Amino acid sequence: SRRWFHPNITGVEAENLLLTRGVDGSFLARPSKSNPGDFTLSVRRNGAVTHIKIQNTGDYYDLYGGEKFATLAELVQYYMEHHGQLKEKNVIELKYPLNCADPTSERWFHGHLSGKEAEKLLTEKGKHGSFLVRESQSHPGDFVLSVRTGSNDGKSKVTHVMIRCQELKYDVGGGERFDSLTDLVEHYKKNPMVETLGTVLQLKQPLNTTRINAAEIESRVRELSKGFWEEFETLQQQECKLLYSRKEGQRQENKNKNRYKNILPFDHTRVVLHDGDPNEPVSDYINANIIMPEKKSYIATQGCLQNTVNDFWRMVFQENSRVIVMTTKEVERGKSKCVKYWPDEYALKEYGVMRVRNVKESAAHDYTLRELKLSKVGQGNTERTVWQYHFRTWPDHGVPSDPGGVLDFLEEVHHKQESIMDAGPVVVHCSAGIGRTGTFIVIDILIDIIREKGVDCDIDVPKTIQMVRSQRSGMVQTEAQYRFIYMAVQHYIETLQRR
Ligand SMILES: Nc1ncc(Cl)nc1Cl
Numbered sequence: 378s379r380r381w382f383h384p385n386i387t388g389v390e391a392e393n394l395l396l397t398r399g400v401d402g403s404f405l406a407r408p409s410k411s412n413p414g415d416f417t418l419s420v421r422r423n424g425a426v427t428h429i430k431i432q433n434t435g436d437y438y439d440l441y442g443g444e445k446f447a448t449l450a451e452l453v454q455y456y457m458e459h460h461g462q463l464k465e466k467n468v469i470e471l472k473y474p475l476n477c478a479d480p481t482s483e484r485w486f487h488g489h490l491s492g493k494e495a496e497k498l499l500t501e502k503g504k505h506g507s508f509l510v511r512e513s514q515s516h517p518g519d520f521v522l523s524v525r526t527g528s529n530d531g532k533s534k535v536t537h538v539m540i541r542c543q544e545l546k547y548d549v550g551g552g553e554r555f556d557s558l559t560d561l562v563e564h565y566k567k568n569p570m571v572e573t574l575g576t577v578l579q580l581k582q583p584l585n586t587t588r589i590n591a592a593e594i595e596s597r598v599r600e601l602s603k604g605f606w607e608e609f610e611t612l613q614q615q616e617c618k619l620l621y622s623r624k625e626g627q628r629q630e631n632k633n634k635n636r637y638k639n640i641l642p643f644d645h646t647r648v649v650l651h652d653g654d655p656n657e658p659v660s661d662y663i664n665a666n667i668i669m670p671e672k673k674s675y676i677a678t679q680g681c682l683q684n685t686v687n688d689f690w691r692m693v694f695q696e697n698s699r700v701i702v703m704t705t706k707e708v709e710r711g712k713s714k715c716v717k718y719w720p721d722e723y724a725l726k727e728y729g730v731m732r733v734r735n736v737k738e739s740a741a742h743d744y745t746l747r748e749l750k751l752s753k754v755g756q757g758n759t760e761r762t763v764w765q766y767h768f769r770t771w772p773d774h775g776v777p778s779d780p781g782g783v784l785d786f787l788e789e790v791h792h793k794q795e796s797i798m799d800a801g802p803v804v805v806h807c808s809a810g811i812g813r814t815g816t817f818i819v820i821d822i823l824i825d826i827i828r829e830k831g832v833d834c835d836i837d838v839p840k841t842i843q844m845v846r847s848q849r850s851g852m853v854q855t856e857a858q859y860r861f862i863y864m865a866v867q868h869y870i871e872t873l874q875r876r
Pocket residue numbers: 703704705768771783786813814816817818820
């Protein structure tokens with residue numbers, strides 16, 4: 378549960394840790410933090426340590442000599458159930474996570490902070506059970522837990538519990554001593570402290586530090602620009618809560634419908650296909666999830682494979698989708714990212730029981746718009762227009778350094794969807810359907826709030842990303858994409874304050 382991730386460990390410290398505190402099968406993961414989107418899996422085996430690279434340029438975690446994964450937590454779960462499935466070039470067993478005591482990626486850790494300022498944040502932002510952990514000021518090396526309990530009529534109060542750090546363990550001046558503030562905090566989360574006159578110091582939710590008023594996005598972005606990385610990693614720590622089942626995707630009958638064997642749709646939000654061919658063993662599966670913002674909904678999906686094109690059009694038809702956003706070229710760096718599932722301009726093709734006419738293509742600077750007509754074969758009166766917005770100039774790796782083109786594209790996709798009465802969800806796809814796809818959907822959700830509520834409204838970027846990540850694994854892949862979400866919204870609000 379993400380304790381195996383050390384966000385501030387050096388390579389030599391990684392080896393030291395595993396040789397002195399670990400055994401054969403011990404492992405941890407770490408950021409190789411001079412080229413963001415590089416990580417290392419460090420693993421003890423035969424009394425030596427081996428370092429395995431994981432690369433993420435924005436579409437998935439690619440473990441050298443292993444598989445592609447939507448999240449580091451999913452990667453670790455996979456190998457901890459599969460001994461012998463990971464091997465070097467000439468097996469490498471992940472057995473025993475080596476736990477990090479670093480508190481820096483916990484939402485509840487504010488580190489740098491004073492008591493009166495911690496009180497004012499809880500007074501303004503906190504509710505009953507809202508808490509944080511801060512460094513002491515009055516006692517170098519110690520920490521303080523501040524908690525809100527109970528109009529400022531005095532019905533609520535803040536309590537400050539001193540946390541002693543003695544000889545590499547933490548305690549509250551009595552009882553158990555813990556190896557980390559996480560362990561302390563987890564324990565008193567489940568076994569709350571009670572003051573002698575009976576107030577239960579329940580730790581219910583950390584204090585929100587991420588929610589901003591969209592009016593002042595420039596201020597946050599400039600503050601995050603000195604940071605974005607610490608906020609992103611805090612968000613990634615919470616991915617361990619999102620290991621929901623994906624058993625439909627793992628079915629042998631569904632294996633060849635997944636572009637990447639281990640990047641699979643959550644059962645609870647998967648798109649279920651009805652009206653399928655009897656003779657097919659399983660005909661209800663596609664690697665797609667419904668994303669509902671928590672109104673315009675989305676389907677996040679992978680690029681079609683040659684054998685899933687028919688399924689893709691079953692899905693568009695059944696869900697009544699009228700707009701498709703394609704975020705990759707068909708081919709990038711010489712590999713297929715999405716097969717061509719639409720006809721050439723003016724042509725008409727049948728895709729199993731579905732029929733598609735390419736009525737007109739219109740080329741813009743950064744994208745092409747294809748006006749497609751979709752109908753079920755043999756059934757007149759089923760025809761509807763589906764608008765495919767195919768963005769063409771996104772970089773092979775990384776993100777654009779200016780969001781002006783994505784924003785223009787997004788505005789036009791939004792206007793098209795809104796113009797169609799009763800349209801169903803907007804289909805959004807890239808290679809695996811998690812990185813680019815996730816990034817586009819999140820920017821679209823945040824920006825819709827500002828479309829409806831105006832510039833003086835509350836947004837919360839990592840809260841929105843967690844909500845969409847509970848509906849499809851690993852939505853928004855990299856810190857680069859996370860920063861891009863911030864820069865896009867900013868660029869949106871800056872053009873709005875203008876006109
Ligand atoms: N192709 C794309 N990929 C990601 C995002 Cl956020 N936007 C676009 Cl247009």
